[model samples]
Target: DSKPVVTLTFGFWGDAKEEAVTLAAVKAFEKAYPNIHIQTEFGGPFNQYFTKLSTEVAGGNAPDIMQMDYEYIDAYAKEGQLLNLKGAKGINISTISPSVLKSGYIDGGLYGIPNALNNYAVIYDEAAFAKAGYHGQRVSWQQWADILEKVHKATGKWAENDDESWQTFGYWARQHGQHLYNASGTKLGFTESTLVSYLNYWANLRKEGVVPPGTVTSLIKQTADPTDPMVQGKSDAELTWVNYVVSLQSEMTRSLALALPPTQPGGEEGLYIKPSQFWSIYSKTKYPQQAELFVNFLLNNVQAGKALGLVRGIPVSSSVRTQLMASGTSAPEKAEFQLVNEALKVATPIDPPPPQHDKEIDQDFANMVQAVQYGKETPQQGAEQFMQEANDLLQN
Candidate 1:
């Protein structure tokens, strides 16, 4: 008896080049599994799909497989919207990195499979540091502040940007002996004093013109491009995820380097591996076996790594990462890979993904910093308001 062809829906979002590669990969996957067919629901931009997919999930028509973000895994997984890949029979998760694996684990259920991994670091231009006559490694925060000043004055260009986001707050909180979220996720992990320290730390640099002003910081492009301050000229350094070094360097004329993020002189290492995003399955998919098989293809296979390259991020699977490197992944990826491993030696286990209003909290944190920077509020005042506003969101 001939079996009926089973059609499976998959949710995805990517740019044109990525989409083309995805369609080709899907074509190959189908050819190998002839009885199964893939129907892609391309979510043009990430935001578009985020809204539609959640709406459809409630409406009972979401795709069998979903692309997931680490921050959002909790909202869905805690409520049974996502499948526990820990129980996935068709896939072997042994290939995934240990640090990144835990990010998708929520309340004893494994909810996501990371396509890429990131870790916090100070991404810098090696050329700029050389120009500034610097030879420093694993510098302390206060030391880094001095270096930023030196770099800016010497290069006649910005040394850093006023880019203090909640992500950086995570590491800074830990460096001072706290976390961004309490383990139980009921409240902020750090005290008001820690928040103020973080807000003012960068604001002080901006005030001295070591980093860009609030005006320039607000206008920084979302992607790495020539128009970017660091790319075209020399805004020497930035605090960001290492995984982006590949993309950031690819867009520029010169390459970038990764350094350990500045820390307190005796602070414990606060860094943890971060999942850039993930491949998660729907808990209620009609075809669980097919969905798991597809996920395996995307994450576990060398062919898949070849098609995807580093776009999704440095592959969390050692097999894929090593294969990528052997195939000459890219110069930037080599730097990303090296830095990830280096940071791992000092990393703590990542705190569980943040609450449902994680993005809202990020916005509030930014508002607090911007307020302090623009004279709308003092650092202490802004910090106080953020705790109330963000804490209330959690209290909801």
Candidate 2:
């Protein structure tokens, strides 16, 4: 008489539209398996939830299926806290983008299934673009500055985030063909120019009023939900993840357009699509079959995919994205799907498993960014401080 009960947990609850769709999908899932029951839990708006969820996971007792954030996937996976879904019966790792699939692998084991294939791009209002008379896709960081200056000249707003640290660093590194982490966790992949230009650009952007300064915006703190500032009309153009636009579009009034992050000189390719995070099964789970089933249920079913609307990122399953698009899940949803697919075709695959303990590195990384934004240090000075702090923390 007892039904199967599966508990799933995730961070970030900013979108009511997503919640509603997920709720409907959950009900449908329950109907499909009359003897199965599901309990779903969400935390924070977005930012707080990730911190809490990572702590809980570190303490053991992670749920059967959980949404893993990119910031902590390496920490959990390295610690063997996640269920390996690479060869799990219902899920086939070989069917998706091999490069993306491999991102969830650490050492030789598959620790998580990427929930979405995502990329970081500069999102702007098409009307805003036209109004400013900006054209062309081949823009360098320097050229980008000119455009933002024009936008600010007309609108008097900044595109810089109070919390644009990681993103700025990402583009800067790409411009120089460096990465954020190394395999041993003791190395930073950026060169001096990469670090300097990254910070200097944002600093200059702040001075020009092309983007919001960190003082006015909370950055990651405001990520609890997707609808705000850039989406809500309080700001213009955000260099953020693709999913942010996906979540905000249904709720925003303006038409949104995305382009590759500003390319670096000699860095011809655009920013690659990153795996938002992976779906990890708790390593200690007694219900491995059930856990895998829950994942399979979520991925294989078209209704759930549409309902989810790329909440976890763009679906790794191309068929799912196509089906959802065909069904008219939503304009924003279709947009997100299109974004990842295109990126995958040309995007370079990132290194598998970042070298540092993800949590410690990310926390410190944010702090370093804060230090620069608050004028406590310059980006170059912060870079040195970061190396020292990182060396200390990653002294493994």
Candidate 3:
């Protein structure tokens, strides 16, 4: 035997489709390098996986490799949790797009190697909007609001999905020349007034019965896709990712169009692109060489790229994406490619990763929206309460 036995722990969450793809890749890697054995790990569902992984890392037992998101990269890397995965050990950055790869380098050290590219967009039902008599191109938020009212009055359907998550909040703030967090990651990027303005903007729609009632909003937030009102043709529009639009298309029979959420009437373009996910290595991993080799295989292998597809997002490697483009383009995939092509002419990426409290901000924003929509608190009250909690969280 030319090599000794080595087993590496790999952790990530995915559906059966993802599991199948990963297992296929792992098997190929093990065949090529017989000395290494790949062990897969999964934790609680959804965000609970991150919670479990963080606790494990705290106990000095994080997996050798993990699939990480943009939100946590900053905090984990800054705290010395991940090993720098720059251009070495069989890794190649020359084939990945610089814009999408920007977030992987936290504090000037590469901590995550992005796997795919994605960005935000608004997808609306074409027939429903036509029924509402709104035959116009993209409009400002105010104009969009007016259209929502028109659609609700004409069709008696919920005009829009009242999704008050961090994505929209970040986009809205960017429209007003603010970010969700300051560059230093220490404070709220926008003011309390801005937050209240956003609340009232949506609250007015709820008041007019254009958005779903609180209970319905709650359900949709918990369960997207098949259950999302827009997918069921019960809602007119949604703020979602381009890849999500692709997924949504797979589940529905209706025609859809993509656009950016309304910008400020005369504000800057705040829409941004982001890497969908990344492959990261834990610091102090005894099997760093094994980890790097596998990562390289995933990024460079043609079979691996075809098998994985866009399960995470579009592939980060230009060569892989080019092959994906040529292999076969389904209608949904074609539309998403068009959306990204259109968006790239104007959309910019978030250069630095967000602060650790990114998801906290998202969850808190959802709570604040629910409180106002459900009549537990007025917009002004909800805004102040959210700002206080968010400010406190950012500081410590």
Candidate 4:
């Protein structure tokens, strides 16, 4: 006789549509595994989700399975809070793209399984581009600047969103063969001279009005909404993840297109396959077998992919990506498939997860950018301060 049924709690964060899709997927999983039942705990926003997860963990009531973002895996694993998922029974990760699957590791132990693989691109309004005498097409960094200048001149709107929030300094540093941290993950990756040049480039763009002013950008929020300058028709372009293009189009009436981010002049590709998020098991879970089974079902099941759609970004499993891409019905879904497939061919390996103090470091970087933009500091001065603060934070 078979063993008695097992029930495991799964916790995640999202909105109504996400909840609907996840509920459907859970139903499907339950139908397949009659011996295992899933009880879901939904948290409203990402920050709140973490709070709830932390409280549950401290109360010794942690869910058997949890959804995590790429950035949090390192800190949690280091704290001995996440299960090492490498050799869990009944989990087959052979089809997941090696580059993205590798991002779930912390100091060589696999603590999670990637749920989605997302990469960044420049998304622009096509009609705006056409009006500016520029076609929405791929270009080198120099060509991109020239195109932005022409767009700014013709449209009288900022060419881009003054991209301080989304396209972080790591993107630029990596384009020039540098990283945010060294392999040992204990220090800075680029020189102060490189940081100065990078800062000056954006500063000059702002001075020329190709990018928006800080006053406009400072009001921006991370959520996809109508108030976004691009969505509001006040900006022509923005750098964001390819998955965001769907939400951007949903929020505006304008026609949008995506292109790979501009490459550095005479430099390597900076684009990478970043895991959108992960499905992890708690180190103290009492149902490791059932949890591993649930994760395997999510990763390899075709029906789960169909049900979830693109809510989690594209799946990391090659077979799943290919299957969905060949059968997608929506134009946006089809385009995302093509864009991601092409980008994957040239994308670099994922960066090491940011250090635990990354939130502080991120604010420091943002403050420096704001200070420079507001004339409170020079670009070189801001760069020096950023380097000093970032190095100190990373070391201690």
Candidate 5:
């Protein structure tokens, strides 16, 4: 038997579930391919994942395979550091969602394999909603606002999660038939009124005491640890991942649930199935054949997708998703699967691929958002500055 060693880089995700699932998948893969030796390297969360990967690439020591974010795909692909994956190892991504598939394709060439599918959802606490005079099911935006107000009145904190309020704002703008960015990804898709409306929604919530401005500033922490807010008694629910909900439920003292995003005021669509994060092999990999084989094993033979649940996102493969659904029921994974199924039924606002220099944009968004929470900039001024800085960064 010929032994081939492969090193792959992936960010550390999930609670204990991530380690457990990845180990199981690795064991399964080893069983199938005894001659292949796989080494897994851990990259930290998104905050540092790409930056570290960039360093590795610059040092000319890129891994055989690595996880890729959709946001960075355009720049990497355009700069020719990524592989032209078209016709590679007989892999075909033609059937993938155009909105998503387009992200990995530049000049009609493929570059990555999607890890899992995900979308935005209002994951909530059912009993909490019931206690606060709100039904988690079939609630409209007005009802959602009313419920959050009641929760805030009763608990004195706020409605919990709006950590990535910009994303919500962007998606909401699209729900209202507006785009969030131009083709160059350097500008806002809507007018000043759109920015006003976006801020006004959150502003009212802030003034009404339904949610705290601190919530935005405090997201990176809460996202890192669910127990602090959504899992603790401080807030009713969170806008978060279905997989993370598992960690939350596992660690929390109460039962929780997820719901569709509340309706936009103008009958706009509010759901989409997003590939939680994508995995792409580096074009600079010295072992492209081995990289594709490893990816193929991870996706197909090992069925890591089924075993992993919604950890990386909902599994993109239909059969894999169904198999995982049939395997058993973990509340968070099942909720995510059902949400994906339901979301697929609706007409969703499609998310365009990452703009060039997308990492700069996300970092810029985070930084200015931090400034707003620290009272360094008023919300209106902060929003304008973010658009300005992001547009300028993208243009560069």
Candidate 6:
């Protein structure tokens, strides 16, 4: 009776392999603290994970610890559903990057801890580029367009897919020293002209056949697919996260390599390392100390770190990243390390956290892009409508 058993349910999302690694880490934690038992609840794939989490929260039986994404933390924190983790005893974050650590805070309270670090880059078919008489070179926006035109002409395939993601639009704005939201997170930061330029850039690519045609565009899914244009050899390049290359490679037969996104006229001044995912504890948990113990084990424990390599992204802990680099077994892990280190050398500070209703804004942007692509609206009209809709979202 002296060593009371405390059962804590940990909820997460992943496939079988990811679950295996997490379970291994949990096993290590259980061995260390025999009195605290961790029962896991896998929420299946990521697409439905958040919806399931929200349902559990509403029912007042959420897991003690849950996996969270950086994008959604603000929404949950505002609802007071997440705990202030700064006061959680014995969880050491001193070895993590200060900039990365700051990403977990919501209104000055620590709501989560970063589990991995990632960033956006262009992943391309190296063999196709070599055959097109082009080396992996960083180029300006106009130069990149010219290269894509050449690639399309030579291969009878599109050069890239039209990434109509809101994040893509935000990157364009940030490149020009604009942000999607103001510092106080109350409104849109970029002007309509900036949005116009971003929309026109891609619309021109579509018109010129540099990106895929309507037939291919209509087939694109919101999530990654094996049949994606670049993955299926219908296109030469795609914009995606650096850490995703490993999985993207699994679906392709060609040799893949990472490239910097085309620089805008303003240059490469908006790039930054983003935390891939976060670990958060629910405020209503019965065993806060035990939950903190598990979180600490996930962050600072070497054995758990080794077992959990690159599944989320590179480790956020510098010491763990260093240790893995020194004894790495996977080529993908080594490649990601080099890619992020090089990116860090030139990257600017991260922008403020995305506003709540960011998903609604993203959907609105995507619909506008589709409308423009299908010739339903001119670029100017699309830009104006998107800015109007987006600003409305920010204010409400």
Backbone collision count in every prediction? 0, 10, 0, 0, 2, 0
Give the clashing residue pairs of candidate 5, or none.
83-283, 118-274
Tens-digit per-residue lDDT, 269-357, candidate 1: 77887777888888999888888888888887777777776666677777777777777666777777777767756777687767678
4 or 5, which is superior by lDDT? 4
Q: Is candidate 3 or candidate 5 better by TM-score?
A: 3
The parts of candidate 6 lying over 4 Å away from their true place are 1-20, 32-95, 107-111, 131-138, 183-186, 222-226, 280-294, 322-329, 346-356, 393-396
lDDT of 3: 0.79
User: For residue 5, what is the lDDT in candidate 2?
Assistant: 67
| Model 4 clashing residue pairs (backbone) | none
Off by over 4 Å in 4: 1-20, 39-95, 130-137, 153-156, 182-187, 222-227, 281-293, 318-329, 392-396
Model 2 clash tally?
10
lDDT by residue (1-396, candidate 6, tens digit) is: 235899999999888888889999898888888899999988988868888998889889789999998778888888988989975666888766666777888888999898988887878778777766767666777888788888888887888888767787777888888888888778888888888888887878988888986567778773348658877778888887787778777776677787777788754466677877889999899988888888988987878888886777778777776777789646666667766766666666568777777788888888888888888889899888988888887878
Q: Write down the TM-score of every candidate.
A: 0.80, 0.69, 0.74, 0.80, 0.69, 0.77
lDDT computed for candidate 5: 0.64
Stretches of candidate 5 off by over 4 Å are 1-72, 75-102, 132-135, 138-140, 150-157, 162-164, 213-220, 224-227, 265-297, 300-303, 306-311, 347-379, 389-396
Q: Local error of candidate 3 at 246, Å? A: 4.7
Q: Give the Å shift of residue 258 in candidate 6.
A: 0.7
lDDT of 2 by residue, 1-396 (tens): 254665444333446665676677778777776565677776635676676777877777466677675556777878878876767875755437877776777768877777667777667777766656875364788888888787767775554344355545755675577777664557776666667777787788877667676665544455425435675576767777777776556667788877666776777353665776667778887777766766666666676776676555677777777787898567776776776676676677665456536667777777887778778898899878877777676665
Every candidate's lDDT: 0.78, 0.68, 0.79, 0.80, 0.64, 0.80
Q: Lowest lDDT 10-mer window, candidate 1?
A: 219-228
Order of models, best TM-score first: 4, 1, 6, 3, 2, 5
